[PDB]
Design a protein around this ligand. Structure first.
Ligand code: SF4
Ligand SMILES: [Zn+2]
Ligand SMILES: [Zn+2]
Ligand SMILES: [Zn+2]
Ligand SMILES: [Zn+2]
Lengths: 130, 752, 374
């Protein structure tokens, strides 16, 4: 839960460990809920798929997740995804029940400077005598 | 504001303009009038897309030539950003001009990003989308349905609707971004992909990625629609050479060859079955082959070749098919023994690198195959697949890779190297041999581009030295310069950290990655900058594997625990969609005041296109020089080829490659001139590479800040952030860092 | 690879080797330039200000000696005194962000003593936890609800941290504040924050000058003093209205009597002109007929804001001088480069530098203008 890498099977706990499969199922459900269409400006899936037929040289192992001698995943990617899930859970929980991109792209520094619109009053200094 | 150049007016969409933007526009106009290529380097902080778009559009809308514009970009995200700028520019022009001009603008992209069919669009693979989309629109299904309505073959209503309406009336006149284009198409029930592709001729400006102009697989069809005299613009071209090198490359594994035999066996079985029921289908195609007709003549416009031409169009032979592969069965035998030969070469127990000529000679000696039949392997296979009319091509997809290999290796002879290495992953119990057909010459793929288009504008925020690209990529430049940014106050504070708090040198060398001293110093550095950074902090690692090891070590050390107190931690992951969600969360945390830190790779996907401006980027931390894996056969072969041909030292190129990827990350912090951010280059080796940075970044770098420690950098950062938050006197930047209309006119008069 | 020892000796003594009056004048002129522009902007005399102070781990930093918590609390006491001296009718409230929650420390009222005492108690409290802008703003939003409509709602957040932990979407609160016409002023301590900038800009009708981050200990006092003066209102916003009020008369009694406000024995007080109930002190809302009792002096203090005295312009040296001595204080102008004479435009009478500052800071009427007979 806290993102610590799962070392070789330790003592752990007989009873709590039985809930690991349920916890994994909950994480998969949470990941599905979090997944949603992303704004095309920052979308990265399209960038890699913009050329579906490209079959260039495969990148070296430095650009791929670490793997063990047997070929199984090292396990570092699992904890990294946990960090993303935890952050997404926190941010999504904030938004409880209780053209936009266009404006952001425009460079504001070149726009007209903000001008104050404070009211002005000129009171008449003519009051009746006692 | 309407301001004039030597002989034309320009409608800038803002009341005031930067001094750099005016100079940038003037130089672009000079290049266009004189002609020829030019390499411009404008600062990333100053607006560049708006300035470039404004001038080029005015140039075509005023001069009699009415030349078209081709605007290339690294990724799709850049296309949308440029499209939004273009539409904003058009709106301003229409308002000032009163009447909306006869102007059209679209952007090419793959089927996946534009598909609207509920079933096909759900596919997770771009190629799978193409297979399904083609099946519903190849024209075979429509003809079969017309012949027999009882046929159950489906169609695509979006594609069919386009037939009713004319091509010139697919969309209303104007600029159509991806979001706007999708909305209109959904309402009208039309396919954006076909509308965009079919309207290339009508468009005045076309925006598409480099892969649509340098990759022959998806460039030969598009290149026929664009006009020869159009203006070509390369935006963010500092990484173009990688695209050129990666376009004519290919990798074959043991699994690929195994599936090739399965596909060939299936192909032979299908041919026999087709022969039994009716052999007239094959006879008609054979007669056409003898006549000399190629795929282009045989295949109709609606249909597409099964295997895209892997080699450049100019290198394709024009003579007739050799004859050894004319018959359906003879070609299958030709394909089969070629696959077996590749399987034999996979058994090598040591690395073997050889030229294509040697590979062909050995191939011929063992199994009798000549150069010429191989060159037609891709073309012949497409015809055979079309003749067989196979409904499903799931098995035959493997044969596509083999066909590509044959044409590539049988067409080019200089600048390509074939490397077979028994160990693809050295840390593997069982070898997994892989043979790589790598391209060493980056100028082969871009040679047609420069020969075709007279004027090319190569511009990028971080592109230096400007003299390397003309050497690495063979072309001549009429003009080339870099613009310094006239800024009232120091908007960015670059620093080169070389030591930790304990005065111990720190470096990201991959062989000492698991060093407690180096790991801890980076960990402490990340925490300290997270404490003083208000909203956004981006960390770029040299490689993904390095990022994983460091993060795992930090978790055990508990350094990440201290980070969690101040900022949410988002990490880039191999999955593309998950990374997009991470960026969404990272942006949200920065905007709402929670604060977040993004851990990503310098040479990853996030660095190419995603701009971390204003609150998003307030500090950028570069954890080491993003060097390439030195012990790589592909890199070593390219370096040797480059040294012998273009006379570039191996060390010089490696520093050039590393610095370009560090510079691009640094330049994503600034969007305008009011934006401020602190750039950190945390590595010992960065100290002596200051001169290799972009000129505008170097100017902001100071001698005192050339070799700093963590304590000094943090103290320096605290003062800088405090100062930059204070209001700036308008008189300071009234007419030096920003120009009004009066200031621009005064400057123009002074020049004359 | 020789070290720095072998190169040379530093020779520190080599570094050292062997117009002010005009500089002061030009410096004053540059400073006076900002004061040259002044117009009688309409300002809301009656106001209700909710003072939010950050009491979190960020306050333990020693940037401001002895610590941020001590200096903020101490200057808050001075701000409370100054705020209620310039604006007598206004009411104020105090909130503090601590342990991730907004804690109320003094109800919104018009008694400076209550707010001063509340701040004094907070002195010993040790800041801890993270700040929460949304919790403070939501609490501030509730506090400013009972306040009358004619009053101008105001929030003055003293933010010291760089990150905010909220339980909900703070953007909703910002929209809600704009709906309730609440203007937020934020005094940052370390660096700019995206959410703080948005909150100030959105609530101040797009003005970005209401979010300020100090640069040293001295600048903090100037920022605190600036918030004392009332803020101008926009043209579009309309709040014109009349407020019922009365002026009670001080009553002297031989025998002490019970006070309606506190139910305590006090020798003297002010009798209300409506219900005749006695109130210990002014200016406060009457405890019985809830009409704000005030003296004529309380209204007088705010007149100078409505009609500020026009700034004086230094006379050119070439032009002749009206007299050799200051009109008001009769101090000879030093002979000296540039004449140090300032004349009021309306009455055209020279003044000295001491009078120029005095006649525009403490004394709010030009002596010459009153002397001139119309
Ligand atoms: S025609 Fe367009 S909508 Fe239909 S499947 Fe192909 S890409 Fe998708
Ligand atoms: Zn009382
Ligand atoms: Zn009363
Ligand atoms: Zn005087
Ligand atoms: Zn006067």
């Amino acid at each position: 839960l806290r993102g610590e890498k799962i070392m070789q099977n330790d003592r752990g706990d007989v009873i709590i460990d039985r809930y690991l499969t349920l916890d994994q199922e909950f994480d998969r459900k949470d990941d599905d809920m979090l997944l949603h269409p992303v704004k095309k400006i920052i979308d990265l899936d399209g960038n890699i798929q913009d050329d579906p037929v490209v079959r260039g040289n495969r990148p070296d192992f430095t650009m791929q997740p670490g793997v063990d001698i047997n070929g199984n995943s090292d396990g570092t990617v699992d904890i990294l995804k946990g960090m993303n899930r935890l952050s997404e859970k926190m941010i999504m929980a904030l938004k409880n029940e209780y053209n936009d991109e266009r404006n952001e792209l425009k460079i504001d520094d070149l726009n007209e400077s903000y001008k104050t619109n404070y009211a002005i009053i000129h009171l008449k200094r003519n009051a009746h005598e006692k | 504001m309407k301001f004039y150049i030597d002989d034309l007016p320009v409608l800038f969409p803002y009341p005031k303009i930067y001094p750099e933007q005016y100079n940038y526009m003037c130089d672009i106009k000079k290049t266009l009038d004189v002609g020829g290529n030019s390499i411009l380097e404008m600062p990333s902080g100053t607006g560049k897309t708006v300035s470039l778009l404004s001038l080029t559009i005015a140039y075509q809308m005023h001069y009699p030539e009415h030349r078209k514009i081709i605007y290339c970009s690294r990724t799709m995200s850049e296309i949308e950003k440029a499209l939004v700028e273009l539409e904003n520019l058009m709106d301003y022009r229409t308002k000032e001009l009163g009447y909306q001009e006869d102007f059209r603008g679209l952007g090419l992209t793959s089927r996946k990003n534009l598909c609207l069919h509920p079933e096909v669009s759900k596919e997770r693979k771009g190629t799978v989308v193409d297979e399904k989309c083609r099946r519903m629109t190849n024209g075979q299904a429509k003809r079969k349905l017309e012949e027999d309505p009882e046929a159950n073959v489906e169609l695509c209503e979006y594609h069919e609707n386009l037939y009713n309406i004319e091509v010139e009336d697919y969309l209303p006149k104007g600029v159509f971004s991806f979001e706007k284009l999708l909305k209109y198409c959904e309402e009208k029930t039309l396919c954006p992909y076909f509308i965009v592709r079919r309207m290339i001729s009508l468009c005045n400006i076309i925006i598409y990625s480099y892969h649509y102009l340098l990759d022959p697989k998806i460039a030969e069809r598009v290149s026929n629609e664009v006009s020869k005299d159009s203006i070509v613009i390369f935006d963010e071209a500092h990484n173009i050479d990688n695209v050129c090198i990666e376009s004519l490359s290919l990798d074959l594994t043991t699994d690929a060859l195994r599936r090739a035999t399965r596909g060939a066996n299936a192909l032979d079985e299908r041919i026999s079955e087709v022969r039994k029921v009716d052999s007239q289908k094959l006879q008609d195609e054979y007669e056409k082959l003898v006549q000399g007709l190629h795929s282009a003549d045989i295949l109709t416009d609606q249909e597409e070749p099964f295997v895209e031409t892997p080699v450049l169009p100019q290198d394709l032979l024009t003579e007739a098919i050799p004859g050894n592969i004319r018959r359906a069965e003879h070609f299958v035998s030709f394909l089969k023994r070629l696959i077996e030969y590749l399987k034999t070469r996979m058994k090598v127990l040591h690395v073997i690198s050889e030229t294509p000529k040697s590979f062909l000679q050995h191939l011929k000696q063992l199994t009798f195959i000549e150069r010429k039949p191989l060159r037609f392997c891709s073309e012949r296979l497409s015809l055979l697949v079309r003749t067989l009319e196979v409904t499903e091509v799931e098995d035959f997809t493997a044969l596509k890779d083999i066909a590509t290999f044959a044409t590539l290796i049988s067409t080019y002879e200089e600048g390509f190297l074939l490397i077979i290495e028994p160990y693809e992953i050295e840390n593997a119990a069982v070898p997994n041999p892989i043979m790589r057909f790598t391209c060493l010459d980056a100028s082969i793929a871009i040679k047609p581009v420069f020969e075709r288009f007279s004027s090319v504008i190569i511009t990028s925020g971080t592109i230096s030295p400007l003299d390397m690209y003309p050497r690495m990529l063979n072309f001549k430049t009429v003009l080339q310069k870099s613009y310094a940014m006239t800024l009232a106050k120091k908007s960015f504070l670059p620093m080169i950290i070389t030591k930790g708090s304990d005065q111990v040198a720190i470096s990201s060398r991959f062989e000492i990655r698991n060093d407690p001293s180096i790991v801890r110093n980076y960990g402490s550095m990340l925490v300290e900058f997270a404490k003083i950074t208000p909203d956004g902090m981006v960390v770029f690692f040299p490689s993904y594997l390095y990022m994983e090891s460091i993060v795992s070590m930090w978790q055990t050390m508990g350094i990440l625990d201290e980070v969690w107190k101040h900022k949410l931690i988002l990490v880039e992951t191999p999955d593309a969609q998950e990374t997009s969600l991470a960026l969404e969360t990272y942006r949200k945390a920065c905007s709402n005041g929670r604060g977040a830190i993004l851990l990503s790779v310098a040479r990853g996907k996030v660095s190419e296109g995603i701009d971390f401006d204003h609150q998003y980027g307030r500090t950028v931390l570069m954890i080491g020089i993003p060097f390439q894996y030195t012990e790589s056969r592909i890199l070593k072969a390219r370096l040797e080829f480059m040294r012998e041909n273009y006379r570039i030292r191996e060390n010089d190129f490696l520093s050039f490659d590393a610095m370009r990827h560090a510079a691009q990350c640094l330049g994503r912090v600034l969007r305008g001139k009011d934006d401020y951010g602190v750039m950190v280059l945390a590595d010992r080796r960065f100290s002596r590479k200051r001169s290799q940075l972009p000129k505008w970044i170097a100017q902001g770098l100071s001698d005192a800040d050339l070799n700093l420690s963590t304590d000094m950098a943090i103290s320096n950062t605290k003062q800088f952030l405090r100062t930059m938050a204070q209001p700036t006197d308008p008189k300071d930047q009234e007419g030096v860092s920003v120009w009004s209309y009066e200031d621009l006119i005064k400057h123009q008069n002074s020049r004359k | 690879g020789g070290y720095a020892w072998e190169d040379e000796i530093k020779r520190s003594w080599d570094l050292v080797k062997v117009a002010s009056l005009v500089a002061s004048i030009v410096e004053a002129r540059k400073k006076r330039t900002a004061k040259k522009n002044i117009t009688p902007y309409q300002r809301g005399i009656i106001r209700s200000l909710i003072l939010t102070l950050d009491c979190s781990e960020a306050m333990l930093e020693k940037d401001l000696r002895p610590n941020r918590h001590a200096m903020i609390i101490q200057y808050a006491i001075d701000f409370v005194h100054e705020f209620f001296d310039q604006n007598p009718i206004s009411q104020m409230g105090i909130i503090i962000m601590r342990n991730g929650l907004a804690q109320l420390v003094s109800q919104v009222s018009g008694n400076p003593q209550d707010h001063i005492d509340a701040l004094k108690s907070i002195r010993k409290q040790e800041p801890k936890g993270n700040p929460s802008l949304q919790n403070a703003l939501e609490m501030a939003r509730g506090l400013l609800l009972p306040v009358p409509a004619h009053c101008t709602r105001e929030v003055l957040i003293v933010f010291g941290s760089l990150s905010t932990t909220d339980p909900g979407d703070i953007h909703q609160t910002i929209d809600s504040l704009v709906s309730e016409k609440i203007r937020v002023k934020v005094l940052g301590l370390s660096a700019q924050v995206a959410i703080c900038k948005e909150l100030c800009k959105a609530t101040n009708y797009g003005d970005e000058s209401f979010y300020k981050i100090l640069l040293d200990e001295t600048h903090l006092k100037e920022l605190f003093n600036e918030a004392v003066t009332p803020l101008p209102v926009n043209k579009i916003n309309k709040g014109f209205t009349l407020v019922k009020m009365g002026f009670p008369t001080r009553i002297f009694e031989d025998t002490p009597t019970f006070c309606s406000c506190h139910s305590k024995l006090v020798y003297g007080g002010y009798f209300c002109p409506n219900c005749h109930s006695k109130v210990c002190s002014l200016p406060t809302v009457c405890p019985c007929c809830d009409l704000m009792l005030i003296l004529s002096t309380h209204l007088a203090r705010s007149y100078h804001h409505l009609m500020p005295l026009k700034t004086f312009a230094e006379v050119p040296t070439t032009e002749k001088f009206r007299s050799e001595d200051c009109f008001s204080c009769q101090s000879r102008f030093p002979i000296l480069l540039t004449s140090s004479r300032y004349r009021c435009e309306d009455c055209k009478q020279e003044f000295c530098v001491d009078c120029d500052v005095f006649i525009h800071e403490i004394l709010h009427n030009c002596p010459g203008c009153e002397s001139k007979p119309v």
